[PDB]
Structure 1
Amino acid sequence: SMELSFGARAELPRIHPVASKLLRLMQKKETNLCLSADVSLARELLQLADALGPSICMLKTHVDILNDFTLDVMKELITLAKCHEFLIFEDRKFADIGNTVKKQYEGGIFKIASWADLVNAHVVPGSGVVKGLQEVGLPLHRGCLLIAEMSSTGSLATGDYTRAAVRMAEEHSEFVVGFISGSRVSMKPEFLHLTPGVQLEAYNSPQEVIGKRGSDIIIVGRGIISAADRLEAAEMYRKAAWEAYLSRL
């Protein structure tokens, strides 16, 4: 008779465990916010995670720009994720053949699969990209997001491409938990939709993204603003996005 809450979706029979965990945290903390940690140093990453952890459901990392990466830094981040209750999403945009991405996900110096709840992939190589990641991620109970649409000028992720991304997700629903897209690309409530939003400040508003287009999670930049202003902004943004979610219910 109506739209499903995040909590209701977390109980669906075919829900992915990582999706369910995420949905329950969103419901509990009343947050739709995925914070982008686009920083170059471990101190910046950990301090941002500590300060803004309470306001977010997810922290999006790029470990390959972290100048002083170590696995110990990642362990500290995981502790913050557990203490403040958010998932870690490594925005690596895996985009190679299956045999290569398997090693890039499990191996090298980053050991991404050992700490990242979620990673994402481009679907251009075909389903082998998902298959390779799944080989590593499934035994570790990880999830994956597929990039189905993009807001950038000249994006080729439209039409049949977007439909192909959705088909891939369905073919690998033991591992793929959702999409990064500008709007809903599937009616199946087990899939999460993450969508870019306007950055924090002291068509991309939470009201349009979450309220009108029905995305689940808004991806927000940290803003070029003070820490005091950032903390205040994060809470105002969280409330606005949450209210938008409630309005659609």
Structure 2
Amino acid sequence: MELSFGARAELPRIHPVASKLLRLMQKKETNLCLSADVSLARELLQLADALGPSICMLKTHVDILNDFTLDVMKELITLAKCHEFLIFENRKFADIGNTVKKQYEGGIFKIASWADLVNAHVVPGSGVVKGLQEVGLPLHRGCLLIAEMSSTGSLATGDYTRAAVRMAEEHSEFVVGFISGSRVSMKPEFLHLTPGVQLEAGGDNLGQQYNSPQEVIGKRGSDIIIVGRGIISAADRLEAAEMYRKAAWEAYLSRLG
């Protein structure tokens, strides 16, 4: 029997980051994550402020920001706290444990110092998680494992997806869920976040494929939709974000019955 986001937030085995997210999802009636791959910090902050009320999460793309500074991230965190959303950095970590540890904690970006959530590919084996968690656990962070991908020709299928689920299960102190196209775990303590979402059928010219909020939340049993271009390329970004929120939310309610 399907549990509400609010109830899931209270599960004995829930990770604190997942609980915080689930609570604000229920409070705000939003299971939308905005993906903002903008080139200017000012753009990022403007979008975060304007759309913050409509979202549960903001997916940043630090590697694309032309004018990144740590002061920008300080201000973003202030917005996140005010509007109540989490920060999820997009970078798809995908290296041996020793290297990913450094990529997560260090450099100019210091991702672990401001991202509530990160995502990682499972292709390197479990060392990728072990490396990340050595940084993430002290900093009270969570991780999502990429169990499936939305793009044409994805190899994240079959036994690969099953491996991701096992890895998650075995690292539940740090791993809080999946990037996936559907529900892949039966355990309610895990979140499912699904990119490749737009209201209309289609794709892009570089292998992205889209499904609707109703399809992925309602039929496929995911929790949260990740939407970038469907919102950002709209004339009215506020209205677009509202449209996606209402879609995703109603699909969730329906499933919940």
What TM-score results when the alignment is normalised by the length of structure 2?
Answer: 0.93
Output one character per residue of 1:92-151: Cα deviation in whole Å (capped at 9) or x when no partner.
111011111111101000000000000000001100000000000001110000000112
**How far off is 1:227 after superposition?**
7.5
Structure 2 CA distance for partners of 1:99 and 1:225, relative to 1, 3 Å: closer
Q: Conserved in 2, the CA contact under 8 Å of 1:201 and 1:233?
A: no
Structure 1 CA distance, aligned partners of 2:42 and 2:199?
Answer: 20
Structure 2 CA distance for partners of 1:197 and 1:213, relative to 1, 3 Å: same
Structure 2 CA distance, aligned partners of 1:226 and 1:180?
Answer: 23
Q: How does 1:48-63 map to 2 (within 5 A)?
A: 48-63=47-62
Structure 2 CA distance for partners of 1:107 and 1:205, relative to 1, 3 Å: same
**How far off is 1:198 after superposition?**
3.1
Structure 1 CA distance, aligned partners of 2:200 and 2:39?
Answer: 21
Structure 2 CA distance for partners of 1:49 and 1:222, relative to 1, 3 Å: farther
Q: Conserved in 1, the CA contact under 8 Å of 2:89 and 2:117?
A: yes
Q: Conserved in 1, the CA contact under 8 Å of 2:119 and 2:146?
A: yes
Matching residue of 1:6: 5
Structure 2 CA distance, aligned partners of 1:79 and 1:158?
Answer: 38
Q: Which moved more, 1:68-77 or 1:197-206?
A: 197-206
**Aligned with 1:227: secondary structure?**
coil
Structure 1 CA distance, aligned partners of 2:92 and 2:175?
Answer: 14
Structure 2 CA distance for partners of 1:38 and 1:226, relative to 1, 3 Å: closer
Q: Conserved in 2, the CA contact under 8 Å of 1:35 and 1:222?
A: no
Q: Conserved in 2, the CA contact under 8 Å of 1:10 and 1:21?
A: yes
**How far off is 1:47 after superposition?**
0.3
Structure 1 CA distance, aligned partners of 2:154 and 2:233?
Answer: 33
Q: Conserved in 2, the CA contact under 8 Å of 1:201 and 1:224?
A: no
**How far off is 1:200 after superposition?**
7.4
Structure 2 CA distance, aligned partners of 1:150 and 1:103?
Answer: 25
**Aligned with 2:231: secondary structure?**
coil
Q: Conserved in 2, the CA contact under 8 Å of 1:199 and 1:223?
A: yes
**Aligned with 1:224: secondary structure?**
helix
**How far off is 1:226 after superposition?**
7.2
Structure 2 CA distance, aligned partners of 1:22 and 1:193?
Answer: 12
Matching residue of 1:97: 96
Q: Conserved in 2, the CA contact under 8 Å of 1:194 and 1:216?
A: yes
Q: Conserved in 2, the CA contact under 8 Å of 1:143 and 1:177?
A: yes
Q: How does 1:142-157 map to 2 (within 5 A)?
A: 142-157=141-156
Structure 2 CA distance for partners of 1:30 and 1:70, relative to 1, 3 Å: same
Q: Structure 1 regions of 5+ residues with no counterpart? A: none
Q: Identical aligned pairs, as a percentage?
A: 100
Say how many residue pairs are matched: 248
Structure 2 CA distance, aligned partners of 1:3 and 1:216?
Answer: 12
**Aligned with 1:34: secondary structure?**
strand
Q: Conserved in 1, the CA contact under 8 Å of 2:52 and 2:85?
A: yes
Q: Which moved more, 1:167-176 or 1:221-230?
A: 221-230
Structure 2 CA distance for partners of 1:132 and 1:226, relative to 1, 3 Å: closer
Q: Conserved in 2, the CA contact under 8 Å of 1:34 and 1:220?
A: yes
Q: Conserved in 1, the CA contact under 8 Å of 2:150 and 2:196?
A: no
Q: How does 1:174-193 map to 2 (within 5 A)?
A: 174-193=173-192
**How far off is 1:236 after superposition?**
2.0
Output one character per residue of 1:139-171: Cα deviation in whole Å (capped at 9) or x when no partner.
111000000011212211111110110111011
Output one character per residue of 1:65-93: Cα deviation in whole Å (capped at 9) or x when no partner.
10000000000100000000000000111
